[PDB]
Structure formats: structure tokens, C-alpha cells
């Protein structure tokens, strides 16, 4: 058996949407012990859906300017973040991760169509891989905002967003930003 | 707004530490600071008192993150 | 209500800057009514969308 | 069951027989209508049935089979079924200015251009689609797209060269 | 002030005997307002009736005109 | 029940009543439509692949020139009819066959060839009544060159219509010059003499093979009028246009630009975003400056005789 | 109040769609035509003379008279479609073609479409000069 962090298992983790199912990783043969793998996943197109989505949450968390190469900093932020999820919920935190991802990526987006100087967006459809890509970005960004200038830890404030999105609650940052992009799109239609 | 925490405990605040805190399921110096108006050093040390009392378990300890739990 | 889709063919790439992708769409209630759509982001053959309307007509502004 | 009928000329007969799958299929299927060509009156004639869904499934079918008679392309006529407001405005080429003789035939040369290049241009920039009969000019597009399709057409056939017309479209196409 | 169609009436047009159909429509007539007779105001109208609206086996590219 | 490529082109999924279904492996690999390969993916497990014998093939080709269809058939179209021959020699009585059947029995009429003989919406009632598009041992072939050779042997087959065949109404082309009938309706030049003296000939074939052919005795078709005119000098170059005499003289490669050659697929609802409600017209390329047009476009001006009264400002191609 | 007629039997009227270049008229009459039933002008709806000959002003006129037509029992119409004719243009505009499609869906049984435009055999002097006019 291959436990993430030696203590979290994968066979419990259950994907709801078939839309996201082939574009969200670890269930069975993607199961790896650490997020850090360092493989060429952006060598050509549609290879970054085969990398483990904990490593996806890693690589989008080193993202800011002062943190911009420090991956072992980040897989430590991840490791302490799952164990705060488990102590607040008791669920396998990978399931909480996936239930926070699915509820986060929007499903219709606006797009500017027309000549320059004319702003008339039309709603289009959101790709499944982009809905993965949009959600992780919206998840990581909410960890920065409520934890840039206060006592709370980013290994902690990540776990407060990644729980509040698996509720689909209004308290999460990645939910309000889905409730805007997909609110604006249905006024563009 | 300004946030003026306490540096040493009060009679009432040391009770909230002794009585309420060991039933949180997630105990952390940032959390204790957030709920009790206490600076990070004092709340970080008070959890080391509550390990010496044995009232509280220990999950993980790091440079920056130390995680505690209610008693079983 | 909320339906699903099947990418049957990727027909082209529309939009102002070459942004959206013009995609042949099968439904997943296995109805042979292929309502054909425009997505945002990368999409290859065999994907599956999630609509909030299937009432998008071939109409020009 | 109510019906429409619509005639044909003799040079437009052979386009129907070349296009009697392609005019045929979308009227009968997408609207649930019945279609005939009365050769004893030589008219195209459609009627409703019980499978006719929309109340105006007939009205926008008549304009589709009108625009094909008026010389428009089959595919470019199909959008009268689909789009809510496409129209057509027809002309007499002498309704703007009394040309005759070869001065009439030089209005056609200006409004067509060498190789159709002037006709191909005004369709692109005014979001329309036009067809030149001899004395007749037929345009097809939206109303404001029509209203600035006539003026590029009118101003070719009262003297101005195409370049003054090409310039003066785009100053109005900015709005 | 006055709703005029309460002051109207309704007559029937009936074709002469060369045709199959006779009753072929209606025609509005204001009633006798004391002075002017309602039959007087009807007495000269023309009807642009087609052919197949009168005789059923017939092709209606033709018309007829008919005086009340 | 021999299956053909036209049965899958019209998608006649009728593997339910006829159950002796044999077919050729080549005539399913030559199909370039993807919905036929979609048909090949699931259903054809009930049929069987089979080839005919070279003894059987040559005897098919003997009365094929005697029914005048051997150049009109394709090469793969030959083997499918020979594939029916082993099935008929296997299952059915050979004693009820014939070959070298019958003469022409010209039924000369005063009907013009281009008259709408049984075109559906055309009427001289006959409506469409929107159910009838689908109402417009053996075989299932929609090619008349295939269907002609079958019924002259006296071989009743069926179609996507589940009933058997009794009536075969189609059109062939007889050379008015060398008296040579081909079943092809696409070509406009002859196959034996190579002229444009092919004329439209309507046929009517029964199940027994009663060939009776309406040769249109009408001098509007039998006409020498618009047939003599002087031709320009033979021109050689990249952009020369010689006036299309033979079926194969080497024209220079003149092609439309692919941004002009394509029309609108306005049916498709992936349609809203971007450009004008019509196709953009090609005003930029040198396909447009050389006035290259479609070969199908302008065909009515080909039918006009050369020595006529053209208007004084026209110039065609 | 009106035609006490059985329901399978229509009560026809005559609708006059007069096109111009400044507005369009919709004008529902008797089969004789001497009485009209309601005349809703196309420049009664829109309060912008710029938009007085709109297809949109044509829809708003024809919906407000098929309301009045259905109010008074007229279930069917024969349409005398009309340009301005005479010296000026002969073919009725799209603002006439709009209102036709407008009261087609509004529940009126549309029978014969008639082209009553005033056409001269041979007319007087065109209003434009020898030089031409914008049209
Ligand atoms: Zn020949």
C-alpha cells in the first residue's frame, strides 16, 4: 500500500463528478508517498492532469514572489495542513481536498467578444481541466488573503479555506469568486 | 483597529486556558491567541504547560507549526 | 437543470484573440441531439462538460 | 391547414432542381412543413400540417424560399429561418438616378466591380449579402446593416468611384 | 368618450348564384343614427373576392368584384 | 443478403430479418465516412467476410459488357456481384436464371429528358407530408450499376425498404455518337468516343429484367444548332484556360483559396462568437484576382450557345 | 359583441400594411375596406423619429392591433401589403415585412398576401433631379 505522508490512504477517496474524474489525480495508480516528485508535467499539452493533485496544490502554493522556488517550504505547508483538516473534521483530508476543489472551479465564465473599446462579454463554457486549474488557483489565493498580516499560519489558513470550500460555504474565498464569475456569466448568457 | 493582547494571564484568562482549551480538537498557538486575546509567546508556552499537566495530546511540532488536540 | 456532455470533435478555435474553442458535443443522456458548443480553456477529444443551459442557438448579434 | 405559394422565373427553375435536397430538407424537418412545386402553375407552395410546431414556422419559411427565388445563395438564405430579424430590401437601379443606355450598364459595372470585387467588399464591411439582377438590387441583412448597405450601393450608382465609397463606409461602420 | 363599436352592427355578404360559396364574410355597418340609414351606408361597397374563395375546384389567380 | 457501402452510407442497419449476410472486406475499408466506421464498430458481428472465386468473377464480367455496365462499375463493385453469385449457386435454384436477356424495345416518347419524371416535390397531389423522407438470399445496393446486373439474372433483392425490388427507375447516358450506354450519371463526356455527345436516357428495369428504355424522340435534344463556333488559339502557361474539350487534357492547377472555397455550416450552433452573419468574401488573395470560379458555378452559361446576343459588357472566365 | 360565428369558421378581415421610408402603417379593415377596425401607426409607439421606420416599431404596432383584432372577433386576415409606389420606390420595405411576421405569431389566421402598391404604367417626373438623390 502507498500512503501519502505515510499516514493518508487513497482508496477511501471518492470522486463525485465524472466531468472532473479524468482530470483529477490520485485514486489508484497515481498514489505516491510525497507530493514532491519533480517530473516533466508541462513537457507537452494535457500532461499536467496526470500529476498528483496534492503536488498541484504544492506547486500553486510556492507561487508568490518571495516564495518563488521554495518547494520544500511548501510540502511542509501541505503536510501540516492535512493534519489540521483531520483534527477539525476527522475525514480523510484528501477527500476534503477533492470536495473543496469540485465546489470551487466555476462552470460558466465570461469572455470579451467584439471590437476594441467595446466591452460586451458573452458567457462561454468552462473546460474541465481549466476548472481544475481555476479552482486550485482560487484555493491557494484564499490562503494568502486571510493570512498575510495576522497571527494565523498558512499551514493553518489553507486548511480553513480547504474545509470551507468542501462545505461550499460562503466563508471561503474560492466560493465567493465562483459565485461571481458564474454570476457575471449568467448576465451575459 | 488596534489589537492589544495580554502578555501574562489574568485570573479569568488562566481559567479559560485550564478549562475550555483542552476540548477544542484543534489546539494551536495561533488559535489560542485568536480566541483569548493573548500574544504568541504566552500562548505558545501555555501549551507546554498543558503538556506537562498531561491534559492535551501532541500531533506535530515544527519550527513554525505546533498542533495539539483535545484529550483523546 | 444541469446537464453533461461528451466532446465528440474539436472543430476549431474561435474568439477575438484565438481564445475559445469550437467543439462538437454529444450529450450524456445518450440523446443523438448534438448541440455544439464553445468552451474556455484546453479541451481534447473525449472530454465532458457541464452546462447550465442547452438552449444556445446559432444566432448572431 | 394554411398555406403559402410563391412563383419562380424560368432562369430560377434550374437552381431549384439543382437544390431540391438542400431547400427540401430544412423546411420539412426543422419546421414540420409540406412543400411542392406546382409545375402547372410553376409555383413553390408550402403548407402546415399537424407536425407543424411554431406559429411562425410558415412565415419564416416563406422568406427563405423567397430569397432563393430572388437569387440569394442557398446557405445564406437559410438564416432567415434561424435568425430573428434578417430582412431584404429590393431596388430599382433607376430609382436613385435616371441612367439608361450604357450609362445604365456602367452602374452595374461600378456596383459589381472587376470580378465582383466591389460586391464582395460591401457585403463584408456592412454585415450583409447582396445579389444583382439587371435593373434590380437585392440586399439581405439586419436593418441598420441594410440602411448602410443601400448608401454604399446608392453612391456607387450616382457617380462616385469605389474608393470614395470604401472610405465612406468605414466612417459609418465605426458606430 | 364614445366606444364606437357598441354603436355598430354586423352584416353578412352573400354572393350571387354563379358561385358555390355564398356567405363569404362580414361587413361592419354603423346603425341608423336617426338621420342616416344603416342600409344607406352599406349600399355601395365592393368586394375583392378571389376565385377559390367562391368555387372550390378552381385556381385563385383570378378575382371578382361585387356590389352590396 | 450481400451488404454494400451504399447501405451503410444511408445507414441501413437491417441485420435482423435477412440473416445470411456476407460482404467484402474491401468495400467497408474504402468508405471515407466516419459514421459508417461507427456502424462498423458495433453491429456487423452478425455478418461474415468472404471473397468470390476467379471462375465466378469472369462469368459475371461476360454479361456485364452484354448489359453494358462493365466500365460503369467500380473494381470493388465487380467482386460484390460475384459474391452474390456463390451465394445464389449455394442456396437458391440456379435453374431459374437467365443471361443475355433481351433487346432494347425503344419506347420513344414526346417527353423531354429533363422533365421531372418522379422527382418528389415536383408535381404536374404529391406533397411531402413530413414522414416520407424515410419513404422515398439477396442484396442491399443503392447503386443502379449494381442493381442493373442483378435483375437481368432474375435475382430479386431488397433495399433499406424491407420489401423486395420490382421496379427500377433511373437514368443512364447513351452516346448519341457511338451508341454506347453507361450507367454513370456523373460524367458528361463519352467513354468510347470521348465527345460531349452523351444524352440523358431514362430506363425502367423489372425484376425479370425487361429492359425498355424511353429514348426521347424530341428535336429540342436532337439539335445541331449551338454546336459550331470558332475556338481561340491553344494557350500554354500557368493561367491559360482552354475551353474544356476533352475529359483529360492537362489543365493547369487552378484552385480556389480554402478561405473562399468553404461555405457556411450555418446549421451548427457553435456559431455565435465573432464575425458577421455570413461568410467573409475573399478580396485579398490572387485566387480572387485571377477570377477563379467554381466549376459548378456558371454552368447555365455553358448551356448558352456561343454565337448569341450577349450583353455588350460581359466576360466569362 | 360582434360576429356570433362558430369556432371552426373564421371571421376574416383585411390588413393594410403601408410602408414608407419614415414609418410603416398597419391598418385593419373590413373586407370592403370602407371601415377600418383599428389603425395603429408605426410612429405612435416609438418616441424617437430616428426609429420611426424601425422593424421594432413595426412589431410594436402590429402586436397592438392583433390585440384589437382578437378583441373584436376578427380571427383571420388578408393582407394588402404596400410600398409608397408611384414616382418613388415600388417594393415594400422590411418595415412592412416585419409587421407581417409580427401578427403572424400573434394568433391571426393569415390568408392571402396581396401586393397592392400604386404602380404607374407611365408616370410623371421623378422628384429627384437629373443628378440623382440618395436612396
Ligand atoms: Zn459516344
UniProtKB/Swiss-Prot annotation, chain C:
<dbReference type="GO" id="GO:0032040">
    <property type="term" value="C:small-subunit processome"/>
</dbReference>
<keyword id="KW-0687">Ribonucleoprotein</keyword>
<comment type="similarity">
    <text>Belongs to the eukaryotic ribosomal protein eS28 family.</text>
</comment>
<dbReference type="GO" id="GO:0005829">
    <property type="term" value="C:cytosol"/>
</dbReference>
<dbReference type="GO" id="GO:0005737">
    <property type="term" value="C:cytoplasm"/>
</dbReference>
<dbReference type="GO" id="GO:0006412">
    <property type="term" value="P:translation"/>
</dbReference>
<dbReference type="GO" id="GO:0022627">
    <property type="term" value="C:cytosolic small ribosomal subunit"/>
</dbReference>
<feature type="modified residue" description="Phosphoserine">
    <location>
        <position position="34"/>
    </location>
</feature>
<dbReference type="GO" id="GO:0005840">
    <property type="term" value="C:ribosome"/>
</dbReference>
<dbReference type="GO" id="GO:0006364">
    <property type="term" value="P:rRNA processing"/>
</dbReference>
<dbReference type="GO" id="GO:0030490">
    <property type="term" value="P:maturation of SSU-rRNA"/>
</dbReference>
<dbReference type="GO" id="GO:0005730">
    <property type="term" value="C:nucleolus"/>
</dbReference>
From Swiss-Prot, chain D:
<dbReference type="GO" id="GO:0003723">
    <property type="term" value="F:RNA binding"/>
</dbReference>
<keyword id="KW-0539">Nucleus</keyword>
<comment type="similarity">
    <text>Belongs to the PNO1 family.</text>
</comment>
<dbReference type="GO" id="GO:0005634">
    <property type="term" value="C:nucleus"/>
</dbReference>
<comment type="function">
    <text>Part of the small subunit (SSU) processome, first precursor of the small eukaryotic ribosomal subunit. During the assembly of the SSU processome in the nucleolus, many ribosome biogenesis factors, an RNA chaperone and ribosomal proteins associate with the nascent pre-rRNA and work in concert to generate RNA folding, modifications, rearrangements and cleavage as well as targeted degradation of pre-ribosomal RNA by the RNA exosome. Positively regulates dimethylation of two adjacent adenosines in the loop of a conserved hairpin near the 3'-end of 18S rRNA.</text>
</comment>
<dbReference type="GO" id="GO:0042274">
    <property type="term" value="P:ribosomal small subunit biogenesis"/>
</dbReference>
<feature type="domain" description="KH">
    <location>
        <begin position="101"/>
        <end position="153"/>
    </location>
</feature>
<dbReference type="GO" id="GO:0032040">
    <property type="term" value="C:small-subunit processome"/>
</dbReference>
<protein>
    <recommendedName>
        <fullName>RNA-binding protein PNO1</fullName>
    </recommendedName>
</protein>
<keyword id="KW-0694">RNA-binding</keyword>
<dbReference type="GO" id="GO:0005829">
    <property type="term" value="C:cytosol"/>
</dbReference>
<keyword id="KW-0007">Acetylation</keyword>
UniProtKB/Swiss-Prot annotation, chain E:
<comment type="subunit">
    <text>Component of the small ribosomal subunit. Mature ribosomes consist of a small (40S) and a large (60S) subunit. The 40S subunit contains about 33 different proteins and 1 molecule of RNA (18S). The 60S subunit contains about 49 different proteins and 3 molecules of RNA (28S, 5.8S and 5S). Identified in a IGF2BP1-dependent mRNP granule complex containing untranslated mRNAs. Binds with high affinity to IPO4. Interacts with DDIT3. Part of the small subunit (SSU) processome, composed of more than 70 proteins and the RNA chaperone small nucleolar RNA (snoRNA) U3.</text>
</comment>
<protein>
    <recommendedName>
        <fullName>Small ribosomal subunit protein eS1</fullName>
    </recommendedName>
</protein>
<feature type="modified residue" description="N6-acetyllysine; alternate">
    <location>
        <position position="14"/>
    </location>
</feature>
<feature type="cross-link" description="Glycyl lysine isopeptide (Lys-Gly) (interchain with G-Cter in SUMO2); alternate">
    <location>
        <position position="14"/>
    </location>
</feature>
<comment type="similarity">
    <text>Belongs to the eukaryotic ribosomal protein eS1 family.</text>
</comment>
<comment type="function">
    <text>Component of the small ribosomal subunit. The ribosome is a large ribonucleoprotein complex responsible for the synthesis of proteins in the cell. Part of the small subunit (SSU) processome, first precursor of the small eukaryotic ribosomal subunit. During the assembly of the SSU processome in the nucleolus, many ribosome biogenesis factors, an RNA chaperone and ribosomal proteins associate with the nascent pre-rRNA and work in concert to generate RNA folding, modifications, rearrangements and cleavage as well as targeted degradation of pre-ribosomal RNA by the RNA exosome.</text>
</comment>
<feature type="modified residue" description="N6-acetyllysine">
    <location>
        <position position="36"/>
    </location>
</feature>
Swiss-Prot record, chain G:
<feature type="compositionally biased region" description="Basic residues">
    <location>
        <begin position="126"/>
        <end position="135"/>
    </location>
</feature>
<dbReference type="GO" id="GO:0030490">
    <property type="term" value="P:maturation of SSU-rRNA"/>
</dbReference>
<keyword id="KW-0832">Ubl conjugation</keyword>
<feature type="cross-link" description="Glycyl lysine isopeptide (Lys-Gly) (interchain with G-Cter in SUMO2)">
    <location>
        <position position="45"/>
    </location>
</feature>
<dbReference type="GO" id="GO:0045182">
    <property type="term" value="F:translation regulator activity"/>
</dbReference>
<dbReference type="GO" id="GO:0022627">
    <property type="term" value="C:cytosolic small ribosomal subunit"/>
</dbReference>
<dbReference type="GO" id="GO:0005737">
    <property type="term" value="C:cytoplasm"/>
</dbReference>
<keyword id="KW-0539">Nucleus</keyword>
<dbReference type="GO" id="GO:0042274">
    <property type="term" value="P:ribosomal small subunit biogenesis"/>
</dbReference>
<comment type="subunit">
    <text>Component of the small ribosomal subunit. Part of the small subunit (SSU) processome, composed of more than 70 proteins and the RNA chaperone small nucleolar RNA (snoRNA) U3.</text>
</comment>
<dbReference type="GO" id="GO:0005829">
    <property type="term" value="C:cytosol"/>
</dbReference>
<feature type="modified residue" description="Phosphothreonine">
    <location>
        <position position="117"/>
    </location>
</feature>
Amino acid at each position: 500500500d502507498i500512503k501519502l505522508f505515510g499516514k493518508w490512504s487513497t482508496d477511501d477517496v471518492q470522486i463525485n463528478d465524472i466531468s472532473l474524474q479524468d482530470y483529477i489525480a490520485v485514486k489508484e495508480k497515481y498514489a505516491k508517498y510525497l507530493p514532491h516528485s519533480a517530473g516533466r508535467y508541462a513537457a507537452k499539452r494535457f500532461r499536467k492532469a496526470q500529476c498528483p493533485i496534492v503536488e498541484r496544490l504544492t506547486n500553486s502554493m510556492m507561487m508568490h514572489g518571495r516564495n518563488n522556488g521554495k518547494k520544500l517550504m511548501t510540502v511542509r505547508i501541505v503536510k501540516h495542513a492535512f493534519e489540521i483538516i483531520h483534527l477539525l473534521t476527522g475525514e480523510n483530508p484528501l477527500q476534503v481536498l477533492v470536495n473543496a476543489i469540485i465546489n470551487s472551479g466555476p462552470r460558466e465564465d465570461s469572455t470579451r467578444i467584439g471590437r476594441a473599446g467595446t466591452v460586451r462579454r458573452q458567457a462561454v463554457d468552462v473546460s474541465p481541466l481549466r476548472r481544475v486549474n481555476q479552482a486550485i488557483w482560487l484555493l491557494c489565493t484564499g490562503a494568502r488573503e486571510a493570512a498575510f498580516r495576522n497571527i494565523k499560519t498558512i499551514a493553518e489558513c489553507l486548511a480553513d479555506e480547504l474545509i470551507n470550500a468542501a462545505k461550499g460555504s460562503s466563508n471561503s474565498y474560492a466560493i465567493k469568486k465562483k459565485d461571481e464569475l458564474e454570476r457575471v456569466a449568467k448576465s451575459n448568457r | 483597529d488596534k489589537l492589544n493582547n495580554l502578555v501574562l494571564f489574568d485570573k479569568a484568562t488562566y481559567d479559560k486556558l485550564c478549562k475550555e482549551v483542552p476540548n477544542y480538537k484543534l489546539i494551536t498557538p495561533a488559535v489560542v491567541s485568536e480566541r483569548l486575546k493573548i500574544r504568541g509567546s504566552l500562548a505558545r508556552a501555555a501549551l507546554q504547560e498543558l503538556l506537562s499537566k498531561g491534559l492535551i495530546k501532541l500531533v506535530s511540532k515544527h519550527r513554525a507549526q505546533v498542533i495539539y488536540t483535545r484529550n483523546t | 437543470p444541469i446537464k453533461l456532455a461528451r466532446v465528440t470533435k474539436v472543430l476549431g478555435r474561435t474568439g477575438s484573440q484565438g481564445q475559445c474553442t469550437q467543439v462538437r458535443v454529444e450529450f450524456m443522456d445518450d440523446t443523438s441531439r448534438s448541440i455544439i458548443r464553445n468552451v474556455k480553456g484546453p479541451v481534447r477529444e473525449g472530454d465532458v462538460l457541464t452546462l447550465l443551459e442547452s438552449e444556445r442557438e446559432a444566432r448572431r448579434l | 391547414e394554411e398555406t403559402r405559394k410563391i412563383p419562380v422565373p424560368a432562369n430560377r427553375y434550374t437552381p431549384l432542381k439543382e437544390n431540391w435536397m438542400k431547400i427540401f430538407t430544412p423546411i420539412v424537418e426543422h419546421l414540420g412543413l409540406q412543400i411542392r412545386f406546382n409545375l402547372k402553375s410553376r409555383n413553390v407552395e408550402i403548407r402546415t400540417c399537424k407536425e407543424t410546431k411554431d406559429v411562425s414556422a410558415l412565415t419564416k419559411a416563406a422568406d427563405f424560399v423567397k430569397a432563393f427565388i430572388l437569387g440569394f445563395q442557398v446557405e445564406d438564405a437559410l438564416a432567415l429561418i434561424r435568425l430573428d430579424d434578417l430582412f431584404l430590401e429590393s431596388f430599382e437601379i433607376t430609382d436613385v438616378k435616371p441612367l439608361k443606355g450604357d450609362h445604365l450598364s456602367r452602374a452595374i459595372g461600378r456596383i459589381a466591380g472587376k470580378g465582383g470585387k466591389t460586391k464582395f467588399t460591401i457585403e463584408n464591411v456592412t454585415r450583409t449579402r447582396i445579389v444583382l439582377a439587371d435593373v434590380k438590387v437585392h440586399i439581405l441583412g439586419s436593418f441598420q446593416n441594410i440602411k448602410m448597405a443601400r448608401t454604399a450601393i446608392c453612391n456607387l450608382i450616382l457617380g462616385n468611384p469605389p474608393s470614395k465609397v470604401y472610405g465612406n463606409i468605414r466612417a459609418v461602420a465605426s458606430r | 368618450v364614445v366606444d364606437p363599436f357598441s354603436k355598430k352592427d354586423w352584416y353578412d355578404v352573400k354572393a350571387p348564384a354563379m358561385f358555390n360559396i355564398r356567405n363569404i364574410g362580414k361587413t361592419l355597418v354603423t346603425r341608423t343614427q336617426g338621420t342616416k340609414i344603416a342600409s344607406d351606408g352599406l349600399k355601395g361597397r365592393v368586394f375583392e373576392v378571389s376565385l377559390a374563395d367562391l368555387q372550390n375546384d378552381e385556381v385563385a389567380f383570378r378575382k371578382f368584384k361585387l356590389i352590396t | 443478403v450481400v451488404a454494400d457501402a451504399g447501405a451503410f452510407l444511408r445507414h441501413a442497419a437491417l441485420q435482423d430479418i435477412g440473416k445470411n449476410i456476407y460482404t467484402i472486406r474491401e468495400v467497408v475499408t474504402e468508405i471515407r465516412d466516419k459514421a459508417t466506421r461507427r456502424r462498423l464498430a458495433v453491429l456487423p458481428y452478425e455478418l461474415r467476410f468472404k471473397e468470390p472465386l476467379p471462375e465466378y468473377v469472369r462469368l459475371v464480367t461476360e454479361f456485364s459488357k452484354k448489359t453494358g455496365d462493365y466500365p460503369s462499375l467500380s473494381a470493388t463493385d465487380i467482386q460484390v456481384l460475384a459474391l452474390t453469385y456463390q451465394l445464389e449457386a449455394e442456396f437458391v435454384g440456379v435453374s431459374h436464371l437467365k443471361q443475355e436477356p433481351q433487346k432494347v424495345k425503344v419506347s420513344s416518347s414526346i417527353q423531354h429528358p429533363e422533365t421531372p419524371l418522379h422527382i418528389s416535390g415536383f408535381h404536374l397531389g404529391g406533397w411531402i407530408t413530413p414522414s416520407n423522407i424515410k419513404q422515398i438470399v439477396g442484396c442491399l445496393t443503392t447503386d443502379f450499376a449494381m442493381q442493373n446486373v442483378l435483375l437481368q439474372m432474375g435475382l430479386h433483392v431488397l433495399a433499406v425498404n424491407g420489401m423486395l425490388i420490382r421496379e427500377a427507375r433511373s437514368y443512364i447516358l447513351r452516346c448519341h455518337g457511338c451508341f454506347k450506354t453507361t450507367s454513370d450519371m456523373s460524367r458528361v463526356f463519352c467513354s468510347h468516343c470521348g465527345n460531349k455527345t452523351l444524352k440523358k436516357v431514362s430506363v425502367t428495369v423489372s425484376d425479370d429484367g425487361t429492359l425498355h428504355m424511353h429514348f426521347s424522340r424530341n428535336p429540342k435534344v436532337l439539335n445541331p444548332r449551338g454546336l459550331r463556333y470558332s475556338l481561340p488559339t491553344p494557350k500554354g502557361g500557368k493561367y491559360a484556360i482552354n475551353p474544356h474539350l476533352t475529359e483529360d487534357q492537362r489543365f493547369p492547377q487552378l484552385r480556389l483559396s480554402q478561405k473562399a472555397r468553404q461555405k457556411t455550416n450555418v446549421f451548427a450552433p457553435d456559431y455565435i462568437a465573432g464575425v458577421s452573419p455570413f461568410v467573409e468574401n475573399d478580396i485579398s488573395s490572387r485566387s480572387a484576382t485571377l477570377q477563379v470560379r467554381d466549376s459548378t458555378l456558371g454552368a447555365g452559361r455553358r448551356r448558352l450557345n456561343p454565337n448569341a446576343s450577349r450583353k455588350k459588357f460581359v466576360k466569362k472566365r | 359583441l360582434g360576429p356570433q360565428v362558430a369556432e371552426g369558421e373564421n371571421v376574416f378581415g383585411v390588413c393594410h400594411i403601408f410602408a414608407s421610408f419614415n414609418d410603416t402603417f398597419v391598418h385593419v379593415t373590413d373586407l370592403s375596406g370602407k371601415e377600418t377596425i383599428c389603425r395603429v401607426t408605426g410612429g405612435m409607439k416609438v418616441k424617437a423619429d430616428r426609429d420611426e421606420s424601425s422593424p421594432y416599431a413595426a412589431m410594436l404596432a402590429a402586436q397592438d392591433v392583433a390585440q384589437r383584432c382578437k378583441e373584436l372577433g376578427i380571427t383571420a386576415l388578408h393582407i394588402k401589403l404596400r410600398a409608397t409606389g408611384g414616382n418613388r420606390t415600388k417594393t415594400p420595405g422590411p418595415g412592412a415585412q416585419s409587421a407581417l411576421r409580427a401578427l403572424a405569431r400573434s394568433g391571426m389566421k393569415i390568408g392571402r398576401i396581396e401586393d397592392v402598391t400604386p404602380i404607374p404604367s407611365d408616370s410623371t417626373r421623378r422628384k429627384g433631379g437629373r443628378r440623382g438623390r440618395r436612396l
